[PDB]
Amino acid sequence: ADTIVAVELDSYPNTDIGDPNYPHIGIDIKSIRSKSTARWNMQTGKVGTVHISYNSVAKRLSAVVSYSGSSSTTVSYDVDLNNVLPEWVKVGLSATTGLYKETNTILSWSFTSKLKTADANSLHFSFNKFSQNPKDLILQGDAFTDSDGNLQLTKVSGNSVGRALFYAPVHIWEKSAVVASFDATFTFLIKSPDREPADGITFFIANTDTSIPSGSGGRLLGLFPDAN
Numbered sequence: 001a002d003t004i005v006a007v008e009l010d011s012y013p014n015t016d017i018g019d020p021n022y023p024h025i026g027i028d029i030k031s032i033r034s035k036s037t038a039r040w041n042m043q044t045g046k047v048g049t050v051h052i053s054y055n056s057v058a059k060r061l062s063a064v065v066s067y068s069g070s071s072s073t074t075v076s077y078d079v080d081l082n083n084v085l086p087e088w089v090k091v092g093l094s095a096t097t098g099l100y101k102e103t104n105t106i107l108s109w110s111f112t113s114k115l116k117t118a119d120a121n122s123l124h125f126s127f128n129k130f131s132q133n134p135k136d137l138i139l140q141g142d143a144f145t146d147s148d149g150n151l152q153l154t155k156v157s158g159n160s161v162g163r164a165l166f167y168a169p170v171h172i173w174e175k176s177a178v179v180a181s182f183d184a185t186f187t188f189l190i191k192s193p194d195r196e197p198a199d200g201i202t203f204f205i206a207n208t209d210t211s212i213p214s215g216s217g218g219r220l221l222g223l224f225p226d227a228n
């Protein structure tokens with residue numbers, strides 16, 4: 001099975017004892033049951049941004065979500081990712097929709113990874129516009145780029161799932177390493193006639209051969225085959 005680390009924005013009704021009772025941002029380590037959560041004050045119709053960072057010395061994965069002119073929400077979790085992920089990964093974005101009329105539009109996405117064993121080894125990319133046949137993205141499921149230069153992760157006019165992976169593998173650790181780190185950011189627009197629709201969007205890190213697991217729609221965010 002796939003090895004998943006993710007930052008989720010999640011407004012599906014969460015059913016298990018001990019889950020948040022509100023839309024939330026969370027940090028997921030190999031399971032849908034988040035290791036750490038905070039309230040997500042969701043605003044359909046308005047552009048939002050997520051920032052994510054991690055460093056192998058601090059060993060603290062942190063994320064923040066915010067909207068223009070509003071207060072931001074943060075979440076953090078202490079973890080050694082070398083004990084969880086393989087050395088080579090792929091990074092990506094995912095979204096799912098419930099029985100609602102909503103869009104999951106990504107307007108921009110950038111990423112940086114550094115690895116020190118000599119100046120460091122590194123990789124950086126930024127998409128502020130998405131082109132129509134993007135040969136440096138692996139699109140899975142329903143995901144596609146429209147003619148306005150936007151990345152649409154789920155179907156545009158129910159129950160959709162789609163993902164976009166950066167094409168090249170990322171080197172996040174090696175045995176002779178001093179420190180490694182990564183940063184990511186993306187901006188998103190959730191359009192809907194409803195104010196609080198059940199929806200999901202993630203940034204994630206996986207084994208390089210990852211694909212959409214069978215039965216992973218809705219609350220499993222296109223990342224996990226089951227809730228255990």
Ligand SMILES: [Mn+2]
Nearest residue numbers: 010014026034
């Ligand atoms: Mn959740």
